[PDB]
């Protein structure tokens, strides 16, 4: 068992693209989602992640501070997928993008809503991850 | 021509139990066998635990029964494959690390909340030796209300039948019926569903042969206990053995003849009424509980009834020991456990892949 | 540990009869509960002729009763909608004008020849007045035997149960079942699917409420006597009453209501095992009984047996009428009971439809 | 709090028989259990008559029948030993050289006409193999009336269990049980008291031990059935077999033992309201029955009924032999006939004494 | 012939209960219903002390409890006529005046200490409103044993069947019968002779008729149970109601008429091997309860078991009365419980006598 | 059983004689009664018989022809004793004299009645008799 | 349900019809089929009749004697259809033409075979007919 | 319920007299019993007991002290019946004398015996006494 990612690809600085997250045989809605990615050399990192849906209110989000305000997480359950839509990319989010489940109930009982966490400790099912470059050459 | 004005309820044929929960009890036992779904059984004693602890060599404490239960019920994801959960008693009032009560948490994801609310096996005295009953009927209406009181809708009895010499006492066969009819009316009366576990346990050198007709012949009398004790057949399930050799005999038995034998014998006794079977996964491995769970749904005997899962072993063996009661072994056992759940789910459906399972 | 060698037909969980016929017996349940087919039960004794003569003034002779068996077994095209025929004893010795015996002249038209080996009611004596036993398993083997030996593969057994104030003795539903399952057994033993036959009543003032409840009481003793004897559950039928309100309550219920009734109350009590149910029509009108069995046929209920019919006057009131016991009736006959056939055919399929039927 | 109205007989505790002959039934047990007399048991089918006869080679004809029950129903004075005898159905029909039928013969000397009203075994079926169940339930209405209706005032019906392998099957003891209820309730509604007969046989390598946990677990099963069917407890009356070893289990019982072993059986089953035990001697030599019988009116165990004999072999054997089927031996075997009737009703009375036997 | 090796005890006929105790069950059973001799009952539970301490205006704590049974356990003499007592769980726990517990104080005077072991009423749930069953099989075993354990030798457990519109539902007359069966069994395998009380009660409008029936199907049922659980015939008494009119049916019913319904229905149903049968006094007055016993053991039909008493109330209610809660009126309390005892030990022998009731109890 | 007679001796022709049969051990009231003489040299013959008692009308008794209107029998069912008083003996007459009793049930139901046979057929209990001796001198 | 006859009409003497009964609601397979003639005054009367086709059989068939040689009835099981084709047409021939269907299952065991009766008793369904003229000018 | 005293009379100093208690009803083996005294104008008081008989060593007794050395109380428990023997009987000694029951149980378990007391608080069912007289004439 895999997610699968895609929506990767090479664009100039300033440009966009849209991963997706797909699961063939597993119901998301279960579960938070996160966007994880690696650059060569580095460790692996958390970008963004999206907790179950709260009914009213939504899911909750959340992002690394290097990419708030560029980078949207969203997820349709009905068609079992997550996305991050990437804009105004730089040169250091070139990396390859994997995304996981979290594996942990995320629940948050005292303030009534799930939530989601960057860290990857309890995440699990990494795809084969897409990769995107960001240049000018 | 002597006449005499009596209560309806005074006459045979009106001994049906009249319980307000009649409608919700219906509706949990669909909610229960809902298709592609089956029951984690999560209630093994502290005793159980032991057992459970001793390969892994964690000591059974209260803290860690509560973190070998939160490694299962904590896992995000397996509201997709189990529709109940069966509780022992000292895990209905443990809290999750979300802040809530293991019921709470299972209520808020979907899946019925139940538990195990029998005292334990003890010796039958009548009968021949090694035979047992099963106690606590009594305070048991009063356990009962409590339980519902704290969001249970189900609960589970277990009565076993020992076979020796290719036969069991009719003292156990009546007794145990009679427990099991007893301990389903007062279920529904406060308002949980009841499992009714008559278990023809695997133990012993007997054939199947000899499991079929003893369990045919258990499981006709249990039946006709609920008859008489005026059980709403609509609001009850069956949590029986699979009809299989015992495990001592050296006779082995495909997943075909498995579920052959099971569902011609259930044919034979259980009413179309009852919305489902869970079959129990008692001696079997992991893997054969699956393929024969798969076998039942692929049989072209009558089965009107639901053929679903409710497993204990067969679902946390793996977990348990990729989990070691460590943290940095609960991605692991979260793995495995999900994987058992999947495949389960899969044999509910009679789709499950014996290739795609022995993978890992 | 005080230990003997016993037999294992010694032991209680041992006691499923060992026949030779298993295997027939299966297949004859199934041939009789074929797709939109059903019994007709043509088993009426010498007094119960009597009966079906009173209206057309026929005399009550061996030929009359011949020619009134042979107005329907010797009608073109019923085995498009009958599966067997119940036939009485004295029949079973009686030649079609083909030649043929009617056993002979019923298997070669593919329908499975059946006898009624009852020997009628008997008043109780234990239990409430008015309440009977059925007698006749005295030479029961003997006479079972010859019935198979001239071609007869399916046999009926009927028992009653008469609600009297809302309810019937325990006497008569324990006495009535260990009847009906001993019956059963010994019927196996010599090749012939037992056609159980628990009927409770129409007769009476009670509800459709107090039926069901009647119902489901006597047919799970039925059953449960049944497995206290052995029946091999796959090579026998039940022929019990829809669940409806009695004759003079003043009731009436819709056939959806009878639906939900009788199928909610099988589904309580009959192992799956068993292959099939084959109602009984006793005091519903021709139309009422396809109206009903249709309704069940269109049941969301669990119903894993067939559900078909076992019909006496609901085939033949009609027919007997237009017939009138004269030759110049017979084909007026046979298009009334042809037409009746084929609604209870197209009952049994889900498909009958009222409009066609008037 | 929804009531209805219902007949005291639809309910479970109202189950009683209720027949007009209940004053009579009483009055006729109490006569059969008188102190100091037992039954003659002159029952035997044409075929046990063969058997009788094969030694002294008198050809079985009804003519020959009549005389050998002739030798003891003429014989004078048994009335004061015996106080009723079973008839075959040939014999209650023939008449003595009185020119009187046998039963106004033995309603003129005071002793109770009786009938023996089963049809003979036959193979159970159900269980294991070798057990047997008894015919003669159809039709059994009518016949119990047309005996009484000729003097008789009891009947008498036996089933069997065979022991083998220690056991016997729970069919069988479910089945004979009922069969055995059955008749003892038709029996009473037509007049007669029922004597119940449920022999466990002496037949087979088993002990005593076996003999008394095969013994009770039947009897106990009867009585059961008994109060399900609604017998006259007052009005009935039991023929069972004593509790001894198994004729070929090489194990021998003193009469103390055997008076032990089968009172206290009784008394862990069978109601004291029932007035009479009559033991069949079934195997046991003519000294044995009579020690055996006077052992248990020696018994300090509780037995409120009366303990008597209902013997056939046990009365007749010497009485045959010396008889040899001539008219000059007539005398010489009623002396011998005579003399087993007062060693019986000595046995009775618990005043027998072996060594005036010899 | 396909055939098994497999245990007596799995064959149907091989299923009476075996007990180490079973010669010491019999033994006590015959000494329990020795002639002339019957049972006090004194086992009421705290609820109903304050019942019999109602009138008298006495506090219910244990240690008034205690006074009330030593009123009786103290008293000498009444070994003449009491073979065994019944004892609440309190009491067998609690210590005479003599320095013993009560039942040691008990085996020392040759009477027999019994103990009730059910743990009470509660409602049936099945069958009809109002029809209850009995509680306390969980852990009976392990109680069983401590009572035995302190000297106690026979036990008592009571279940009820209320009539009610003529009849009792099926559901009651086989839930209770079971349940009466199963703790007999119990009980022997423990070395306590099991008192079973199948209580028909009086309460109600029905008729001796009724009772009648009612009765004779509930102890049939009773039986056929202790048959199927496998009861040691010898070693058990039954305790069950006489046949009477109910309390609130109007009906007259005589001593002679009551015995004549009594005994015939226990004729019936009950196996002589059983050896005795102590009457609860339920609803009688003391009076009736020496009258109706003292008739049953006058009764012409087959009574082949002892037919004695097994009384609270009617033993007790002049005692408690006399006694007015104080130590000043223990004599007249005990003269009153000692005429009650001679009474009823009197009508055991079918020689009591109404006239020298009223004038004895008179003074 | 025996019977046991009892009343013989010597006595000279024209004389008399009572014999008594007494049953110690059996209720003779059920019985037809017969005494029987053996003289020398003859066989056993029937001598008298008394049938059971007849309500109302009383026994029936039978006699040999050579004894009729000399001898008398009679029976008295409380004494449980048959008597035969033989009157006007001549030397004929000597024997040894047994009782016996009848084993058949006598009754003749076409004329209501028990009766008696002096034939020896179906007697049986003979006693050991007793011996009259009817001479001169 | 009727049969509904046609293939009527007026012919000189020498022609030919064809005539056709069609089955609406029914399964004809399971019939003998006969057709019959009603002429100006005189009663209805059998020309020719079929009888069932079972399998390996074929079907017998019967012609009234005015009509032997010059008439063939013949069917179609498939399209449940009954066929009479009318040669050499005759005056006498005019009549109104009917079918209909037997009501008896005409099975002779003696001879192990299907046959027909051109005798109207068992018949039924009657269509309304189709009316048959031969005449010159 | 009485006892009955006998036994009584007139006698002069130093003489004796044999007092009897019977009971027709009571087993007195079950009761201490207790001989009592009332004398003209005084208080009825104890002058004896004897207590439930010991096993292996007998009944124990008690004695007022005016009454000590003087008087025996015995038992048999067979006749049912108790007796004080009382000699050298002085003028004090004149009175009515009953007998008595104790009602209490006593028994003393720290010690294993019954044992009896002359205290008349816890004795009943007394008898109508006997009047003993001592004087000189």
Redesign the interface.
């Known amino acids: 068992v895999q997610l699968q990612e895609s929506g990767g690809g090479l664009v100039q600085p300033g440009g966009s693209l849209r991963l997706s997250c797909a699961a063939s045989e597993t119901a998301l809605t279960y579960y938070a989602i996160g966007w994880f990615r690696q650059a060569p050399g580095k460790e692996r990192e958390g970008v963004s992640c999206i907790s179950a849906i709260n009914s009213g209110s939504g899911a909750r989000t959340d992002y690394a501070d290097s990419v708030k305000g560029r980078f949207t997480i969203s997820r349709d359950d009905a068609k079992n997928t997550v996305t991050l839509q990437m804009n105004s990319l730089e040169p250091e989010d070139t990396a390859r993008y994997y995304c996981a489940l979290d594996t942990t109930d995320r629940y948050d009982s005292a303030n009534g809503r799930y939530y989601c966490t960057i860290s990857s400790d309890t995440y699990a099912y990494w795809g084969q991850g897409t990769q995107v470059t960001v240049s000018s050459h | 021509?002597?006449?005499?004005?009596?209560?309806?309820?005074?006459?045979?044929?009106?001994?049906?139990?009249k319980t307000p929960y009649e409608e919700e009890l219906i509706e949990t036992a669909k909610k229960m066998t809902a298709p592609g779904k089956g029951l984690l059984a999560a209630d093994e004693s502290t005793g159980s635990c032991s057992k459970r602890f001793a390969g892994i060599g964690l000591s059974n404490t209260a803290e860690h029964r509560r973190q070998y239960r939160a490694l299962m019920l904590?896992?995000?994801?397996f509201?997709?494959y189990i529709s109940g959960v069966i509780l022992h008693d000292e895990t209905v009032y443990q809290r999750?690390s979300?802040?809530?009560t293991f019921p709470?948490?299972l209520r808020?994801?979907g899946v019925v909340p139940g538990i195990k609310t029998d005292?334990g096996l003890?010796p039958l005295?009548?009968?021949?030796?090694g035979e047992q009953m099963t106690?606590?009927?009594?305070?048991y209406?009063k356990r009962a209300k409590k339980y519902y009181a704290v969001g249970c809708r189900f609960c589970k009895w277990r009565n076993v039948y020992k076979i020796?010499?290719?036969?069991?006492?009719?003292?156990v066969?009546?007794?145990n019926a009679?427990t099991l009819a007893?301990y389903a009316?007062?279920s529904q009366?406060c308002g949980l569903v009841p499992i009714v576990e008559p278990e023809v346990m695997i133990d012993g050198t007997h054939d199947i042969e000899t499991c079929q007709?003893?369990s045919?012949?258990?499981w006709?009398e249990v039946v006709?206990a609920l008859?008489?004790?005026?059980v709403v057949?609509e609001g009850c399930l069956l949590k029986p053995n699979m009809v299989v050799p015992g495990a001592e005999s050296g006779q082995t038995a495909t997943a075909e003849q498995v579920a052959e034998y099971t569902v011609?014998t259930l044919?034979?006794?259980?009413?179309?009424?009852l919305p489902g079977v869970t079959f129990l996964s008692g001696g079997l491995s992991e893997v054969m509980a699956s393929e024969y769970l798969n076998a039942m749904n692929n049989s072209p005997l009558?089965?009107?009834?639901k053929l679903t899962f409710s497993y204990a072993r067969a679902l946390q063996s793996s977990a348990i020991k990729a989990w070691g009661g460590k943290s940095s072994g609960?991605?692991a056992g979260?793995?495995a456990f999900?994987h058992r759940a999947?495949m389960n789910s899969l044999a509910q459906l009679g789709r499950y892949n014996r290739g795609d399972d022995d993978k890992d």
Do not use: I
């Not at chain 2, 209560?7 to 049906?16: D, E, G, V």
């Not at chain 2, 009558?302 to 009834?305: A, I, M, S, V």
């Open positions: 021509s002597r006449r005499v004005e009596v209560l309806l309820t005074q006459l045979p044929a009106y001994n049906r139990l904590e896992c995000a994801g509201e997709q999750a979300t802040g809530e709470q948490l808020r994801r005292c003890e005295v009548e009968g021949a030796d106690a606590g009927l009594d305070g209406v020796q010499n290719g036969t069991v006492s009719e003292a066969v009546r007794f009679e007893r009316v007062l009366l007709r003893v045919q012949h258990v006709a006709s008859h008489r004790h005026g057949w011609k044919a034979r006794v259980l009413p179309p009424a009558p089965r009107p009834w609960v991605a979260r793995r999900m999947k």
